[PDB]
């Protein structure tokens, strides 16, 4: 009686992450359609993530006041309608699209901060962990499907607008299900508590470095997932061979496959490395960061040579980078005591979104514009400028790796502090 609800929620999350990244797979066309610089292309994702991080704590609090199913159904319909309306914006008005992206961010934040609570309430066993794994495995599949949907729809209909039309309709078919087949589960000072928790977590050392590391990871993931298809299209343009829907299709498929493989390999490496030292969880993550960096820079030296080498680097870097997702949560839960775990998770997500994904696309676009304005205008210069701008990603990756190394250094001391405080 509850499995149908879990399946519907998983499909809704697939739709959520498909609609989130649909803009990126057609981003180039948007930049061509509105005739704007790369600053606006960065602004789309930046405003989306900023609205998401602003709205996330509010919906997290609100989900304990009213009916969660009602809020979820309202949010899904809201974001679907906003996307559908944005799919008809005139060319002259650009900022209205950014406002629509912000509204989409609010709507998706509602779903992302509500649905996991419903799933946790539905089941209480290892089956709950299995359901959560199924739900959260919808992230890479949804991102890959979003890239594929945007590229294929642009290829087949000859217009990018249709992409922003495909996702919302399914959401409608999803939304009704949420109002119908999802059961209602009757399951169940704050400011001062939050302030005390923040004061206590500031004094914590490994938590801050883990937050910085995951902020760097979010920065890298957002910037790359936003700008890589455009960079590859520009490289194909400058390449002697003349062509880019297939490029986005390949990137999306590689993204999904690498997400699955990287999550599995990271989990397995953590399992196999726990038997040798207690600092396995951070260090492995650190290795992954390094494992990404040496490969990420590789594409910036191999993009001008051939596309196959670029895609190989994308595959390896995506795997090694996505390896940290499962381990970061364990790193967090190992240090913070259960009393403050919810506040720690909320603040870590807030900081990771703020210092990371919020500014990465806009910063990359700003760097690209600054480099391009001082140089001659030519497609080769566009591609080279975008490469030099994306060169800031591996530096942040290495900084995050060093932060993970520091977390590994302070891991045992912070664990001892946590256990002493719990037993005190």
């Amino acid at each position, epitope marked *: 009686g509850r499995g149908a609800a879990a399946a519907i929620l998983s499909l809704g999350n697939v739709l959520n992450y498909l609609d989130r990244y649909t803009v990126a797979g057609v981003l180039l066309d948007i930049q061509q359609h509105f005739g704007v610089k790369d600053r606006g292309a960065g602004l789309l994702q930046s405003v989306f993530i900023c609205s998401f991080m602003v709205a996330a704590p509010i919906f997290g609090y609100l989900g304990d006041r009213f009916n969660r199913k009602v809020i979820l159904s309202c949010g899904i319909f809201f974001w679907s309608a906003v996307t559908f309306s944005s799919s008809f914006i005139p060319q002259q008005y650009f900022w209205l699209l950014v406002l629509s992206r912000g509204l989409v961010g609010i709507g998706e934040a509602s779903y992302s901060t509500i649905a996991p609570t419903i799933i946790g309430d539905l089941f209480t066993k290892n089956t709950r962990t299995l359901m959560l794994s199924v739900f959260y495995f919808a992230i890479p599949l949804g991102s890959g499907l979003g890239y594929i949907t945007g590229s294929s729809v642009k290829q087949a209909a000859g217009d990018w607008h249709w992409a922003l039309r495909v996702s919302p309709v399914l959401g409608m078919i999803t939304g009704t299900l949420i109002l119908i087949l999802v059961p209602a589960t009757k399951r169940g000072k704050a400011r001062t508590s939050w302030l005390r928790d923040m004061k206590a977590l500031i004094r914590n050392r490994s938590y801050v470095f883990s937050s910085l590391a995951t902020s760097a990871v979010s920065f890298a993931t957002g910037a790359l997932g936003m700008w890589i298809p455009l960079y590859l299209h520009r490289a194909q343009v400058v390449q002697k061979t003349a062509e880019g829907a297939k490029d986005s299709l390949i990137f999306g498929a590689i993204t999904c496959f690498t997400g699955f493989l990287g999550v599995v390999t990271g989990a397995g490496a953590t399992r196999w490395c726990r038997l040798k030292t207690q600092r396995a969880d951070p260090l492995v993550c650190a290795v992954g960061m390094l494992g990404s960096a040496i490969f990420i820079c590789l594409i910036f030296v191999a993009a001008k040579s051939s596309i196959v080498g670029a895609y190989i680097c994308i595959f390896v870097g995506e795997t090694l980078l996505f390896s940290n997702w499962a381990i970061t949560a364990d790193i967090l839960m190992y240090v913070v005591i259960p009393t403050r775990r919810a506040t720690a998770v909320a603040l870590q997500s807030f900081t990771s979104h703020l210092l990371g994904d919020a500014g990465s696309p806009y910063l990359i676009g700003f760097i690209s514009d600054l480099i391009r304005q001082s140089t001659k205008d030519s497609p080769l210069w566009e591609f080279l400028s975008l490469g030099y701008a994306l060169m800031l990603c591996p530096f942040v990756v290495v900084l995050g790796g060093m932060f993970f190394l520091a977390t590994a250094l302070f891991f045992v001391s912070d*664990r001892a502090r946590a256990e*002493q405080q*719990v037993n005190q």
Partner: nanobody
Amino acid sequence: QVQLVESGGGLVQAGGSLRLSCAASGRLLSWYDMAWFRQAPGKEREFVAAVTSTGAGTHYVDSVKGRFTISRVNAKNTMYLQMNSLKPEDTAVYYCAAANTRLTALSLRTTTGSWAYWGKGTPVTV
């Protein structure tokens, strides 16, 4: 796949000093909260002392405070328990127990059901 070996148990003089050692070899010991239990001939398993993963949190029984000291060396994966001024009620079979590390109040987990790993158990006579 963790197996515990007890040592240092046996007949001792009344009120003498004794040391009990628990060794874990199957897997790394820095991932397990350990504890000692005593089975009495006329009673069931009784909690004695417990230590967390690092060693910064230790819990005892109100009838044993100030007499027994429990410590651990995670480098050699060996837990030690020094018992001094042995009362005659201390004669029992001591079992070393290990559980996966959890950030719970060690004073709350005395139920002989939370510890899924057990040792052979050595007898001590006062």
